[PDB]
From a paper:
To further verify the role of [name] glycosylation in modulating [name] up/down disposition, four additional modified constructs, BA.2.86-[name], predicted to remove glycosylation at [name], XBB.1.5-K356T and BA.2.75-K356T, predicted to acquire [name] glycan, together with BA.2.86-ins483V as a control, were characterized, and their structural features were compared with the ancestral strain. Thus, we performed all assays under the same condition by using three representative variants (BA.2.86, BA.2.75, and XBB.1.5) with strict controls (loss and gain of [name] glycan). We observed that [name] glycosylation dramatically increased the proportion of the ‘closed’ form from 19% to 79% in BA.2.86, 50% to 75% in BA.2.75, and 45% to 90% in XBB.1.5, making the ‘closed’ form the dominant population. As expected, acquisition of [name] glycosylation generated by the K356T mutation in BA.2 and XBB.1.5 decreased its infectivity, and loss of [name] glycosylation raised by the reverse mutation [name] in BA.2.86 increased its infectivity. Moreover, the binding affinities of the BA.2.86 S-trimers with or without the [name] glycosylation for hACE2 yielded similar results, despite [name] glycosylation promoting the S-trimer ‘[name]-down’ state. Interestingly, the loss of [name] glycosylation through [name] mutation decreased cleavage efficiency and the reversion of S621P moderately increased S cleavage, indicative of BA.2.86 S-trimers being more likely in a postfusion conformation under furin enriched microenvironments. Not surprisingly, either the loss of the [name] glycan or substitution R681P/H in BA.2.86 substantially reduced the cell–cell fusion activity; on the contrary acquisition of the [name] glycan or the mutation H681R based on XBB.1.5 contributed to increased fusion activity. Notably, the [name] glycosylation decreased BA.2.86 immunogenicity by ∼40% in comparison with BA.2.86-[name], rendering BA.2.86 a relatively lower immunogenicity among [name]-[name]-2 variants.
The dense glycan shield consisting of 22–23 N-glycosylation sequons per protomer is an essential feature of [name]-[name]-2 S architecture. The glycans have been shown to play intrinsic and extrinsic roles in protein folding, modulating conformational activation and immune evasion. The transition to the ‘up’ state exposures of [name] for the binding to hACE2 is also a prerequisite for S-mediated viral fusion, directly correlating with infectivity. Here, we dissected the role of [name]-linked glycosylation, acquired by BA.2.86 sub-lineages, as a [name] conformational control element in attenuating viral infectivity.
Numbering used by the authors:
A (entry chain B): 727 to 774
B (entry chain C): 727 to 1064
C (entry chain A): 968 to 1144
D (entry chain A): 47 to 68, 80 to 138, 158 to 210, 212 to 246, 263 to 482, 484 to 677, 689 to 726
E (entry chain B): 534 to 581
F (entry chain C): 47 to 68, 80 to 96
Write the structure that this text describes.
Amino acid sequence: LPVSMTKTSVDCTMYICGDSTECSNLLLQYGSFCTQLKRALTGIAVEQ
Amino acid sequence: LPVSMTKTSVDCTMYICGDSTECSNLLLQYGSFCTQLKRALTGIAVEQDKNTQEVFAQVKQIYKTPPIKYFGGFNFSQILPDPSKPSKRSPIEDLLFNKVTLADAGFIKQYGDCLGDIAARDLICAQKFNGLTVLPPLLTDEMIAQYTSALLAGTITSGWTFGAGPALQIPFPMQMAYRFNGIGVTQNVLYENQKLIANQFNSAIGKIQDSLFSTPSALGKLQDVVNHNAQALNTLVKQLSSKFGAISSVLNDILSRLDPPEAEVQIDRLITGRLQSLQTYVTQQLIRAAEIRASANLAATKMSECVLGQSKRVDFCGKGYHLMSFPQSAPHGVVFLH
Amino acid sequence: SKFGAISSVLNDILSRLDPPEAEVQIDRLITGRLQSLQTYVTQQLIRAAEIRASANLAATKMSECVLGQSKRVDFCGKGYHLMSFPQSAPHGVVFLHVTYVPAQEKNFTTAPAICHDGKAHFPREGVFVSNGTHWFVTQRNFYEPQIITTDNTFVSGNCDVVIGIVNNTVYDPLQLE
Amino acid sequence: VLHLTQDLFLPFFSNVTWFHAIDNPVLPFNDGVYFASTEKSNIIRGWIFGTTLDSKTQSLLIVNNATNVFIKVCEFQFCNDGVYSSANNCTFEYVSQPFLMDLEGKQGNFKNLREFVFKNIDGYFKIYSKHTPIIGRDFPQGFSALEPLVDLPIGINITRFQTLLALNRADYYVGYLQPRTFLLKYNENGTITDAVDCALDPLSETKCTLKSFTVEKGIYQTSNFRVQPTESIVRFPNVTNLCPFHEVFNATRFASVYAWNRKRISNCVADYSVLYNFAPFFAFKCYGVSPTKLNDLCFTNVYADSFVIKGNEVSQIAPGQTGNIADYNYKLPDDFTGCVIAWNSNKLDSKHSGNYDYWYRLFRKSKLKPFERDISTEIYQAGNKPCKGKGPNCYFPLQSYGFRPTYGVGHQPYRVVVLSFELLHAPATVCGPKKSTNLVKNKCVNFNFNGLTGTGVLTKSNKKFLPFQQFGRDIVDTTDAVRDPQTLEILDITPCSFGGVSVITPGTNTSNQVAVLYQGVNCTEVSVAIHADQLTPTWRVYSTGSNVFQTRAGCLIGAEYVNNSYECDIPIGAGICASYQTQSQSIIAYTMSLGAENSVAYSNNSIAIPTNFTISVTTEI
Amino acid sequence: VKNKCVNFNFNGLTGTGVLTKSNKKFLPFQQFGRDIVDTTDAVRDPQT
Amino acid sequence: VLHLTQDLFLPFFSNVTWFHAIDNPVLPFNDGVYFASTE
Ligand SMILES: *[C@@H]1O[C@H](CO)[C@@H](O[C@@H]2O[C@H](CO)[C@@H](O)[C@H](O)[C@@H]2O)[C@H](O)[C@H]1NC(C)=O
Ligand SMILES: *[C@@H]1O[C@H](CO)[C@@H](O[C@@H]2O[C@H](CO)[C@@H](O)[C@H](O)[C@@H]2O)[C@H](O)[C@H]1NC(C)=O
Ligand SMILES: *[C@@H]1O[C@H](CO)[C@@H](O[C@@H]2O[C@H](CO)[C@@H](O)[C@H](O)[C@@H]2O)[C@H](O)[C@H]1NC(C)=O
Ligand SMILES: *[C@@H]1O[C@H](CO)[C@@H](O[C@@H]2O[C@H](CO)[C@@H](O)[C@H](O)[C@@H]2O)[C@H](O)[C@H]1NC(C)=O
Ligand SMILES: *[C@@H]1O[C@H](CO)[C@@H](O[C@@H]2O[C@H](CO)[C@@H](O)[C@H](O)[C@@H]2O)[C@H](O)[C@H]1NC(C)=O
Ligand SMILES: *[C@@H]1O[C@H](CO)[C@@H](O)[C@H](O)[C@H]1NC(C)=O
Ligand SMILES: *[C@@H]1O[C@H](CO)[C@@H](O)[C@H](O)[C@H]1NC(C)=O
Ligand SMILES: *[C@@H]1O[C@H](CO)[C@@H](O)[C@H](O)[C@H]1NC(C)=O
Ligand SMILES: *[C@@H]1O[C@H](CO)[C@@H](O)[C@H](O)[C@H]1NC(C)=O
Ligand SMILES: *[C@@H]1O[C@H](CO)[C@@H](O)[C@H](O)[C@H]1NC(C)=O
Ligand SMILES: *[C@@H]1O[C@H](CO)[C@@H](O)[C@H](O)[C@H]1NC(C)=O
Ligand SMILES: *[C@@H]1O[C@H](CO)[C@@H](O)[C@H](O)[C@H]1NC(C)=O
Ligand SMILES: *[C@@H]1O[C@H](CO)[C@@H](O)[C@H](O)[C@H]1NC(C)=O
Ligand SMILES: *[C@@H]1O[C@H](CO)[C@@H](O)[C@H](O)[C@H]1NC(C)=O
Ligand SMILES: *[C@@H]1O[C@H](CO)[C@@H](O)[C@H](O)[C@H]1NC(C)=O
Ligand SMILES: *[C@@H]1O[C@H](CO)[C@@H](O)[C@H](O)[C@H]1NC(C)=O
Ligand SMILES: *[C@@H]1O[C@H](CO)[C@@H](O)[C@H](O)[C@H]1NC(C)=O
């Protein structure tokens, strides 16, 4: 029986904008579309 | 154990296009991206209604505790309902209701005090300002108390027979003797140590009240469910101030500033942003509803097993050799006393 | 659905527009249909997980209710479970839980133990039940009175610790022979 | 199929005006008009359309006759009775088979009903008809299809409508169409057997939202209900001084492009009719805001940059452009919120013997970042010489826009003035001449406070607004409270009425009576709104006083409260359940009965032992 | 040609498929044919 | 409310230059300057 799987904590900010300030500024116009992802992954890891 | 979460009936048309005919016409070009969301949320609400039904409504007949309360020395006042209290809840049930704070009660009809908010309008009024409403549960938190009281009265005056067929009365010392016989210890042990067992049970019941009283949060699972609901809803409502790559985030400002043939680009950008945010919310709510369904099916089988009889399953009805369990109603959940 | 494009027909738009400008409408149509297909796939995955839960429950119900007797309450239908029979249904299964349900009951009397001679007697299995005048021993889920003999009850006590003890005589088949 | 359509239809159970004849009022035409008449053999010839029905506006005539029809689009003068007297500028004649078809079974009793619907969506005149033998003894209630005959593009304006009579030696059934959503049932053979409206009855709306003809017993969420605002309140600032646009458009020495004069406009009322007056406009490119909607927005600041410039560089002047002027003289921001103005001026920038006063720069070290002025006379370096002077490889930075009265349009002295705005959340000071209406509290109104558009209910408050505070919000960034510009007081903002309507009905195979539940709203609010006719729902369910119920889930309309308790059939919410029970039949609301009220007989020494048993077979699926 | 995969260009209605005779009840004004999901099902031949 | 803002602010526990008077050097201006004086 599987009991657990790998825990991942990907980072949206750079995953979308590799060390690019203009891209980060543009991504800031999309609201909290990143905090949701980080929270979901963190909850998955804690639940694991 | 969590049993249900808050029920929502989000309205896509108002949420995305606040009273804007041009925006509604533009949204009509996206097909049934709204009917699916409404159907999913309605299915979740009806499903959670069914969930509370499964968890609590396990008895067709409502039993009532006998007027006199002397169950062989066992002290059941802490879990039996209190006639003095207006809500007819046991003291152990009252602590659970007091230690859980609901952001949105739902059965408030809060319209009429958004003008009367005086100070900064709260999260609920803000949600009402932008197309997000909360339906109330079909089973009131008072009638659930009646169900719990019936289940509690049936298991201390009739043993487990009322869970199978007609309720047959049996004295509590004999019911305890049979629960003892179910784990391999003879009844003479109880009939010789009745006073000591009664004192131990009374002390344990007394001390769990203080354990729940003084703990920071032992109800952390229900509070986590409520917090996740409120936080998901707040993250949704916070997306109505995100430009999504448009010139401005206010539909009323944009429609009054740009003529339609150019404004339609910004309106379409806002449509794509808000639709995708709403899709994310709906998907996360579906996943959480499935998780709550799993947990509350576990709660239902736990009720039918430990409450309506003795369970031979180890650790399922608490740690150690299980004897009984008393259900207690909690806001959006249930509490078992193994 | 146009998805904000000029038209919703690829065969029309390709033949109506030359590609360098047709690609805008085509990209809009992909942007719409891809998201619709993602929504469909996500809903199907969630429903598949729910059906997984239901099918695992059905499998354990089959293995328990059918292939044996279950001591779990209400799991194999309401009442004391006896058996079950599976039936095939389109995209599902139907179980026929055959359960034992008790019936008409009579209020008699009960005593935790019976003191014959300074010793408490407890039924080996069953209840000490009294018609009203002559104490008896019977089973739990059915009424079948029997004469209180030394084999139906095991003795250990001192006739002074059990509460509610009722005086009666217990029989033995040994003194007579 | 049960295909659902949204198009101009005749409302179900609507008002139809029945006329007589024995003079011919001109019935108005709007969104199409439904026509019907019953006659023995023939008394109606045709119909006349158009505007003002005279020899000044194009008109229509649909006159029928024995064998053909005489369609044309022309400009008749009048007849006042050979139905016209003018065909001067008249084309597009049309003749085809006659619309009227009369058949009799050797008796005049068969007064066939002739049904006609016309509409003028995007021109393209649509005419639909059907002749049914349902005899016309009464306006019948059976469903009748209507098929089209011809469909032709008039492409003219129609507002009035008239009819034609016949000679001889109870008709005119006129209806008006409206934009409605319709659900039509198509037969297996393709005909339409049944159809129901979606904005007439609550059951009709559920039937629309669950597209089908049989509605199973239950409760269905269909749409939402909103109280549409009664009045529109606009409260602009307390300033009436006209802006100095007059003084910037009356100037005589608009500086050159190299030095763009920049004026600031503040503390004034901005009416742009004065902009239109002093402007033989040639270029009105506006980017941030639509020029037509320019009087209805409040601006925190307005900048007026003016400079004379040649014709083609007017097209150069735009956000995100290129060229010697857009690079070295004047660059607008890419996200420019504003509008540009350009009108020709050959009378003030021209004279005999010429004029060379104006200047422009083609030589700069780098591009001009947006809204920067670069007045400087430095010779552009060429090669590697620190040369400071004129001549080869030593070029003067700024050259001359010499203007004379004789050039082409591409070389004529155009006058350009741009207007820079900033529409963000700030205390506005400049906006339109829109009047300041009164203030009414505790009522759904559309507010336009200092350019902040919206809708809701406003009243008194007890905030602690600091002197500089202007707005109010919440952790979700939504405008909550606004300070009155002409009163300096604090008012909160309310949602209009947002809720949700759910209809409680039994199966249509049982009955058609329905109940309406307004979710999460005090029922006094909907009652006064329905009385003032300000509810977006157009289906008005009856309220007889005995069918009102303040539930914890909202309020219920259409069912009465019985104090009994039953196992319920339709969940509502908050321990209340509705059912269709006999009185002789009606829908009732009652609190749930959790089950049979039973008491056990627990005692110290009593035991109940079953003396019998039964075998029951349950089913699990 | 019927009963064969062909590309049809009926009155500007582009597409591909197999066409054959039918027993529809096309009204005189009817020209096209669709289904419950709004996809072109049957076409009326302009020249027959 | 616990509103979060991104704007030019004086850093917490930062370096602040305290002067005296009894000549008036020019201080550079960049991204705003926080000024305070007791008298
Ligand atoms: C059962 O347990 C109850 C505990 O809630 C007992 O109530 C107590 O009553 C005393 C006053 O006599 C209070 O001071 C105390 O705080 C507690 O509420 C109750 O007496 C007891 N009854 C029996 C029969 O044991
Ligand atoms: C106690 O239980 C007895 C069963 O043995 C019942 O006595 C019976 O009485 C009949 C005559 O009435 C005898 O013939 C028979 O042999 C038996 O002893 C008796 O009814 C019962 N008492 C009560 C109060 O139910
Ligand atoms: C059961 O029968 C016993 C004798 O067979 C009883 O014991 C008697 O108790 C009395 C006091 O109650 C003594 O005075 C006497 O000497 C004898 O010990 C016993 O009480 C009785 N119990 C009941 C419940 O009847
Ligand atoms: C669809 O159209 C068919 C062809 O006209 C109809 O079939 C006919 O039915 C009549 C009886 O009404 C027969 O007499 C005739 O031979 C033919 O089979 C069919 O009924 C019709 N279906 C409808 C109107 O629902
Ligand atoms: C227990 O209950 C049975 C039914 O649930 C009884 O069987 C009945 O027998 C009668 C004849 O006496 C039939 O008419 C009836 O249809 C049914 O089969 C049974 O007698 C009963 N036994 C006792 C001891 O109560
Ligand atoms: C036994 O008698 C008591 C006394 O009233 C009664 O309450 C109880 O229901 C009876 N039990 C039965 C008839 O099974
Ligand atoms: C039709 O007109 C009559 C007379 O004005 C009116 O009483 C009736 O209500 C109208 N019909 C409807 C559906 O309103
Ligand atoms: C009717 O109108 C047609 C239209 O061309 C005309 O030819 C014909 O003479 C008119 N009169 C009769 C009796 O048909
Ligand atoms: C047709 O319209 C033109 C428009 O100017 C007008 O000059 C001419 O007189 C008209 N012909 C008539 C009225 O016969
Ligand atoms: C049509 O006529 C009406 C009535 O005078 C008028 O209000 C409208 O502007 C006209 N429209 C056109 C396009 O002429
Ligand atoms: C400039 O001012 C004069 C002064 O009366 C006026 O006559 C003229 O119309 C004005 N022209 C413009 C373009 O404002
Ligand atoms: C607005 O102007 C009027 C007219 O001068 C004046 O009476 C009133 O006090 C002013 N109100 C404010 C708030 O400035
Ligand atoms: C809503 O309930 C009633 C009915 O309208 C009335 O007291 C008032 O309008 C509201 N009351 C509260 C407490 O919101
Ligand atoms: C009957 O219903 C009325 C309200 O309709 C309620 O006031 C009354 O208390 C009810 N009577 C009983 C006995 O429940
Ligand atoms: C049971 O016994 C206790 C104490 O002996 C007494 O208080 C109570 O009333 C008794 N109840 C019954 C039903 O005999
Ligand atoms: C098409 O035109 C040809 C040539 O006149 C003719 O033979 C044929 O009948 C026509 N078919 C139709 C359907 O009009
Ligand atoms: C402030 O300046 C002093 C002296 O240069 C230095 O020691 C200190 O670290 C500075 N403060 C901070 C926070 O670096």
